[PDB]
Amino acid sequence: FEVLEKWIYRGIIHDPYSEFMVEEHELRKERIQEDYNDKYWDQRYTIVQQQIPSFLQKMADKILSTGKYLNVVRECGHDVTCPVAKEIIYTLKERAYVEQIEKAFNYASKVLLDFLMEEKELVAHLRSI
Amino acid sequence: ISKEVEDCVPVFLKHIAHDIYVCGKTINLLKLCCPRHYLCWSDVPVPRISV
């Protein structure tokens, strides 16, 4: 849960041994200066199958998206900070972790979309194409 | 409603044999379609587990 708390609230994946469900491929070696593969949205931050906890399999896809979105603003130097980092504890009969994963996921997409539609404004570039 | 013709009158009473079947398919359908504010999967507040 401590690893997921870092990945959901920041792009960091400390994961000293290869155990966490998300993995970070060093696809910078081939795609850098020119993001030939647009790797960030393709094969930079990718998923692992046999290291999924089996209780988080319903939120499995969302977790990856939750954290990848953080990087493409944490890559460009605009400071991205979660408003509050809430701690998460295993529990049975009470999926309170579900609501928290969602509260973080929604802030992630919201921040990236707002920055993109004002900074790197996409609406104007799309007209002048 | 009865397993084969072996209905459990003790648990179903044959009454909830049909009702249980219905509720299961409707929640699974609405939820399947999309989280709705009133239910939104397990967004429903403190429903006593009871049973």
Three-point CA angle A76, A77, A80, nearest 5°: 100
Spatial neighbors of A19 by CB under 8 A, at least 6 apart, are: A3, A51
What would you report as the CA-atom Rg of chain B, rounded to the nearest whole angstrom?
14
Give CA–CA dist B11/B4, Å, rounded: 16
Helix, strand and coil percent figures for chain A, each rounded to 5:
40, 5, 50
A29 vs B: CB within 8 A: no
By what method was this entry solved?
Answer: cryo-EM
Resolution (A): 4.1
| Chain A residues with beta carbon closer than 8 angstroms to that of B42 | 95, 98
List the end-to-end C-alpha distance of chain A, in Å, as a whole number: 45
A34: its two tokens: 């020119």
Residue A13 near residue A25, CB atoms below 8 Å: no
Give CA–CA dist A10/B21, Å, rounded: 44
Residue A69 near residue A107, CB atoms below 8 Å: no
Give CA–CA dist A66/A39, Å, rounded: 17
A1: nearest Cα among A85, A109, A71: A85
A95 vs B: CB within 8 A: yes
- Which residue does chain B place closest to A93, by CA atoms? B49
- Cα distances from B33 to residues A8, A63, A101, B36, B47, in angstroms, run 27, 22, 21, 9, 22
A99 vs B: CB within 8 A: yes
| Chain B residues with beta carbon closer than 8 angstroms to that of A93 | 49
Give the other-Cβ count within 10 Å of A22's Cβ. Answer: 21
Angle separating helix axes A2-9 and A97-118, nearest 10 degrees: 20
| Chain A residues with beta carbon closer than 8 angstroms to that of B43 | 99
User: In the block, which residue shows the tokens 């200066």?
Assistant: A33
Q: Cα-flanking dihedrals φ and ψ of residue A29, to 5°?
A: -55, -45
Residue B37 near residue B30, CB atoms below 8 Å: no
* Cross-chain residue pair B49–A93, CB shorter than 8 Å: yes
* Cross-chain residue pair B42–A98, CB shorter than 8 Å: yes
Q: Give the helix/strand (H/E) hosting A67.
A: helix A60-74
Give CA–CA dist A71/A112, Å, rounded: 10
Give CA–CA dist A30/A39, Å, rounded: 9
A38: its two tokens: 């647009």
